[PDB]
């Protein structure tokens, strides 16, 4: 069963005595129904919808990396509402292993 990543005590040792757990808000913000402008036409309302996607949002950490909107299933990865053609570039499921080959390295 999965119980999280394994931690060695050495990795829990801080580099400063004042280090605490970063208090970054992971609430993306306040939202509601997407509100279109009357002036916008069909094309410009499409752009508006594409700019309100929660799955394109993320939270930036103190070191500049961002934790993205994540989901257990790929159903939450398409634009909402679903466009006619979704996964043009095949979504990549990344598997990890310990195998390596020499060609990838240089001395």
């Amino acid at each position: 069963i999965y119980e999280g990543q394994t931690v060695q005590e050495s990795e829990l040792i801080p580099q400063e005595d004042d280090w605490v757990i970063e208090e970054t808000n992971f609430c993306l913000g306040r939202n509601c129904y997407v509100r279109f402008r009357e002036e916008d036409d069909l094309a410009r309302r499409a752009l508006h919808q594409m700019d309100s996607q929660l799955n394109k949002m993320h939270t930036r950490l103190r070191d500049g990396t961002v934790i993205p909107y994540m989901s257990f299933h790929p159903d939450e990865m398409v634009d909402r509402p679903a466009p006619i053609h979704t996964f043009s570039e095949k979504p990549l499921l990344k598997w990890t292993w310990d195998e390596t080959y020499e060609e990838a390295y240089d001395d």
């Binding site: 999280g4 394994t6 931690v7 580099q15 757990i21 950490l61 103190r62 070191d63 500049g64 060609e103």
Partner: protein, 196 residues
């Protein structure tokens, strides 16, 4: 080892220069293979015959230059000069000198991160380890609490079930006394109504 040994694409030769396998309907022309073997000589026999590539001798000096500049390539070029290179030898030469394309990570543009942010990498990793430590411990804590609680449900379901056991128990006692003592039980009482 694919398609029964039949090559998907292969060369065929015809002796008559104006021959067309689709327009003509003659029955004397015999097609040849890429090496020139007539079709009436079976594959099992022709494949045993040794065929070697013969280049014009004017190419020998070029093939010699190739061997000297690349010594690993010399044995194959020597076979070609001496007319000892079969198709298999050519294939071995071809695949021996094929190399994979190289990707350089140093040429990849990086997502923008300020120097202040780059100095906090160790801190963020430190936070991540403590989050994984707290996650793993909580799993044990929660598993113990809730699976223990489920026992309260077993006991509550055993108490409520026992209430119906007692009702059923009393029901059976009552039933045993109906035909024996109950005045509600009457015999020689119901008389046939008869047809209307």
């Amino acid at each position: 080892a694919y398609n029964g040994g039949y090559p998907f694409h292969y060369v065929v030769q015809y002796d008559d220069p104006n021959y067309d396998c689709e327009a003509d309907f003659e029955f004397e022309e015999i097609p040849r293979d890429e090496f020139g073997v007539p079709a009436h000589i079976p594959p099992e026999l022709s494949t045993q015959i040794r065929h070697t590539y013969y280049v014009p001798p004017q190419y020998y000096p070029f093939l010699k230059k190739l061997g000297e500049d690349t010594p690993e390539l010399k044995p194959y070029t020597d076979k070609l000069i001496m007319g000892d290179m079969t198709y298999d030898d050519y294939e071995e030469m071809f695949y021996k000198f094929a190399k994979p394309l190289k990707i350089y990570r140093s040429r990849l543009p990086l997502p923008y991160r300020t120097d202040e942010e780059i100095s906090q990498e160790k801190y963020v990793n430190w936070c991540g380890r403590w989050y994984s430590y707290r996650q793993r411990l909580q799993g044990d804590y929660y598993s113990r609490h809730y699976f223990r609680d489920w026992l309260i449900g077993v006991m509550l379901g055993m108490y409520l079930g026992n209430l119906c056991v007692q009702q059923h128990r009393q029901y059976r006692v009552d039933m045993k006394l109906f035909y024996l003592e109950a005045p509600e039980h009457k015999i020689n009482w119901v008389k046939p109504r008869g047809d209307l």
